Amino acid sequence: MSVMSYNGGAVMAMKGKNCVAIAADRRFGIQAQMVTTDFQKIFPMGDRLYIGLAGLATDVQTVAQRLKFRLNLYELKEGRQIKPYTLMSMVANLLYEKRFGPYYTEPVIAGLDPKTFKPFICSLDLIGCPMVTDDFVVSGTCSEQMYGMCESLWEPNMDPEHLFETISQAMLNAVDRDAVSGMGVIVHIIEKDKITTRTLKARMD
Template identity: 60%
Template structure:
């Protein structure tokens, strides 16, 4: 019979006191939980939106309020939350792989194809994974149908028909998106919805926020907007 024990502290427990919180200790050593960040993608009517916060920090220390987490690869957008160094590494890795795909195939990569590329690339590193939680958004080139999906750190794909979230503000984002999202939103309504969801969610998470970037992806154009958020 196997028994799973909870992690414990090597520090002695004080008589009559409460033992140290092992869960809090584990969270303190987990890079995605210490670096913070938030990303969300939403589906609209013939359009799709993806947004991220701009904070770069280490727990309570804020290093920068201009650290974008969304990267464009042709017609596909990738949002990355997690360890900042892995965000930079993974974004450059996919820049290389997408450029090689374009040279071989002589066409831009489709969102569904890019999602499988992300999944297989992350799974290759499953024994020493990147500390990132990617989100992919785009429009299918042939049908114009919105496409969004998310991943865990080893590449398991989570397809979605409404919205997908990642980062330390995930729980808050889920609540806001469930409250505000509606089917068949137009580009302007979709922008308002994703902006309100993200700004209100990061206000309730100490590790993310400090402004946001929002991309509205339509068939013939991409609109990028900068949102000013609380700086505290």
């Protein structure tokens, strides 16, 4: 899921965890180079309608390869009446980037999602075309990876409800936009229940 460059006018993903919900927060940023004109266009996409995968950088191949991957995820989702596992999709994405051989164009995938029908928490980032990345901790990713990583450690509420994570996250996104050109350009925060997706769109330039 290789995208041309990184210049997409914003590149940032943060994922942060609870035991009652898990959240993936994203720039909703679009429009390559410094000049934007828009602040809307899909980037995080529901693929089982309750798991997300985020593909990050320039708009065209980000949307294009996601959709072409969606079709292979779908095949597997379609046939059986139960939908695919997160761990098997996690290597699937790793391989998809790898197919684009040596001296490849850099994407940065972030997968956030609770596992389907074996219930445990999952957060992962891919980048380059790299070794397997299953973690159960926290993951922040992009080219300003260090800046995201800080925030992904920052939100975990192990015992508060879903709501407190959102309000904490709104401040977390904002402070990050003042620190880098990767956050911002409108922010979409996704709190993911297992049975559906809740999309909230945050106020913030």
